[PDB]
Amino acid sequence: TVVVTTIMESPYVMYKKNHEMFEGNDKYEGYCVDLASEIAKHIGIKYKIAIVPDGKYGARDADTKIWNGMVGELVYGKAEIAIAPLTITLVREEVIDFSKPFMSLGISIMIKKGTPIESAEDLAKQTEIAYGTLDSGSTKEFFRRSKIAVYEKMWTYMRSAEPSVFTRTTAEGVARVRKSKGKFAFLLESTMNEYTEQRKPCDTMKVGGNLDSKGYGVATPKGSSLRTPVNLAVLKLSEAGVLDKLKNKWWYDKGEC
Amino acid sequence: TVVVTTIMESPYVMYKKNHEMFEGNDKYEGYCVDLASEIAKHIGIKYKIAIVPDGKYGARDADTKIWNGMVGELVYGKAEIAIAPLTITLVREEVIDFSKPFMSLGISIMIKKGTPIESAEDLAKQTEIAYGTLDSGSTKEFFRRSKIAVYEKMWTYMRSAEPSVFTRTTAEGVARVRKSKGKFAFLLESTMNEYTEQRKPCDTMKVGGNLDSKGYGVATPKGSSLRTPVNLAVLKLSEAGVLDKLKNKWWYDKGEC
Ligand SMILES: C=C(C)[C@H]1CN[C@H](C(=O)O)[C@H]1CC(=O)O
Ligand SMILES: C=C(C)[C@H]1CN[C@H](C(=O)O)[C@H]1CC(=O)O
Structure with missing residues (x-):
């Protein structure tokens, strides 16, 4: 019912081994895949993961005046939520909303x-x-x-x-x-x-x-009624220890050095 | 015109040496005093600093059901903005709005x-x-x-x-x-x-x-038209290097060890 835009970036979103024999959301694994799952459970939504067609994060083009990437998907109503390593910047928060940061950098x-x-x-x-x-x-x-x-x-x-x-x-x-x-x-x-x-x-x-x-934040388009539930879900997960647990899982538990 | 609630905490808000011979906002110095000043310049407001009467940050009382501290000042309409080391938590964001974090901890x-x-x-x-x-x-x-x-x-x-x-x-x-x-x-x-x-x-x-x-965030009561200008001012200051400069000023430039 709800369209989640994201991008291929290790270890946030990636293909599972043998992704050919899986359908829909089950093709993907990673930090942001787990995060979408936790958020959807808390706010009580069903979701479809869609990979941003242009492989971009989001910038406004100098001449066309048009936003590309995931920001663009949200701005033009192609998606309801972006869950990705999308950095909270002034230019972006001018056209979309971010939750509180789910990760610091x-x-x-x-x-x-x-x-x-x-x-x-x-x-x-x-x-x-x-x-x-x-x-x-x-x-x-x-x-x-x-x-x-x-x-x-x-x-x-x-x-x-x-x-x-x-x-x-x-x-x-x-x-x-x-x-x-x-x-x-x-x-x-x-x-x-x-x-x-x-x-x-x-x-x-x-x-x-x-x-x-x-920080990175979960993005929604301006005027979305999912803005508040999303923001509060992030704080809930952060305070519960889930964000830390997820970081350790995809960064350190898998560490080879 | 605009009432800024805050609290006495080193080095965020404190009395200047010989504060007796100063009036209004000029009595105070510190990180949050400088921060209020930067924010007010960007959003173009005049402000009065008021020290929270009960010396508290903000918690809901178990029996009276009433919020105390700076959160309380905002909730009950005694102040328009809180600029202090006020930690962004789920319970608080349920009753007030925070800007993006101006400081991580x-x-x-x-x-x-x-x-x-x-x-x-x-x-x-x-x-x-x-x-x-x-x-x-x-x-x-x-x-x-x-x-x-x-x-x-x-x-x-x-x-x-x-x-x-x-x-x-x-x-x-x-x-x-x-x-x-x-x-x-x-x-x-x-x-x-x-x-x-x-x-x-x-x-x-x-x-x-x-x-x-x-993080700590700047707080406004729900439905405040200063919500967006404040949030964007914080991102502006952060990206301009001002938050870092302010931290170094009140933490490290003064360091004695
Ligand atoms: C991986 C990329 C290109 C993205 C990720 N976050 C940043 C962003 O949202 O702009 C970009 C990284 C960077 O610019 O260093
Ligand atoms: C100084 C105090 C009592 C405040 C400051 N920020 C935290 C707060 O906003 O709750 C408190 C510190 C703490 O609880 O460790």
């Missing part, structure tokens, strides 16, 4: 083990080690808009960098870090960073602190 | 340096070192309501403990930790814990991780 640095970098300050003062960001998302927008001297210097480098320091997906950025032999550093959300650190061949690490402090 | 352990305790598990398995909580607030409510084995064992000890392990104020709990010579441990929010660690005689420390993950 910050922008962080991924290096290949042995790269002599300990902070964002280290990266900015040199050119030998290239560094980049996804070309779509809140991390790029953070650097684009920063007045802080260090991040301003980082944005000037990145927008000019040749060849392009921007990657299309998380896997692509992680791939580039691994194959570059200490010569590429990846700026990404600490949640994905921590997850990759736990995955073989265990050649990556998070360095320094987070550059910022934010 | 978690329940934590304060010990006197040299107390051989490294985790919550350590405290629960022994009786020689007493441990307590404020007798009013979200920390007590967390232990009261936990199904997690370890915290359940901690609550059973605390509610039965003789003499009372509960303190009326933060200063009183910190006082008890300092004067007990390693025999009392204090369960409090990590923000207050971190702040005390930076204050002379530098005899306290935070040990282990946070037991949970939550």
Whole structure:
């Protein structure tokens, strides 16, 4: 009855092993799949998981004026709820509603083990080690808009960098870090960073602190009567220990390093 | 024109040195005083700071059925906004609205340096070192309501403990930790814990991780037309670096240890 928009991202939503022999929601597993299930039980709804057609999170296009991604699905009435690692930002909360955060994070640095970098300050003062960001998302927008001297210097480098320091997906950025032999550093959300650190061949690490402090939230379109039940469900789950339990399950219980 | 309810708590709201010769809002300084000022500038309001008469944060009384503290001020229309270290909890969000978190925190352990305790598990398995909580607030409510084995064992000890392990104020709990010579441990929010660690005689420390993950938020009563401007102001300030700058100012720039 209720359409849940989400996206393929490890370990939030992914295909089960042998997903061919499963139907509907049963094809998928992950943190956000479990989260949708808990939320639906508390607010008492039936739901259909739909993967966002364009594979995007949500940005407003400069010329067409149109929102893409999951935000777009909500804005144009194609979906009722988005349950994904969708970062709570000002631009988005202007057109959709977020619940309280179900997970906390910050922008962080991924290096290949042995790269002599300990902070964002280290990266900015040199050119030998290239560094980049996804070309779509809140991390790029953070650097684009920063007045802080260090991040301003980082944005000037990145927008000019040749060849392009921007990657299309998380896997692509992680791939580039691994194959570059200490010569590429990846700026990404600490949640994905921590997850990759736990995955073989265990050649990556998070360095320094987070550059910022934010959260992912469950999104609903403006005026949805599911806004309050959803927000309260999240607080219920958080206080019950369920969010912590879910994090440990998909991040640390499966850890290989 | 707009009434801002808040409370005396270091370093969020406090009296300036020689506050006698100042009038109105100018009597006060602190993190939340600066925060009110930033918010009011963005949403374009004039405001009067009022200290909550009963010195409480906000709980519903078992018999009278009446909310006390800052939550009460909002609920009964005595104030329009609460700007304070007011923890976002399910019970409160049921009767008031919170903005997105302006600060992240978690329940934590304060010990006197040299107390051989490294985790919550350590405290629960022994009786020689007493441990307590404020007798009013979200920390007590967390232990009261936990199904997690370890915290359940901690609550059973605390509610039965003789003499009372509960303190009326933060200063009183910190006082008890300092004067007990390693025999009392204090369960409090990590923000207050971190702040005390930076204050002379530098005899306290935070040990282990946070037991949970939550935030403080700006509160408005249900149906307030200041709800959205406030929420968006917080995201604006957060993304601009102002919340981080404010934290460093009142926690670390002043640090003595
Ligand atoms: C995986 C991606 C592209 C998403 C996830 N959350 C962020 C977002 O919602 O924008 C993006 C990550 C990033 O931008 O670093
Ligand atoms: C200082 C106090 C009593 C407040 C502050 N925030 C929490 C609250 O809003 O309940 C309380 C702390 C705590 O309960 O540990």
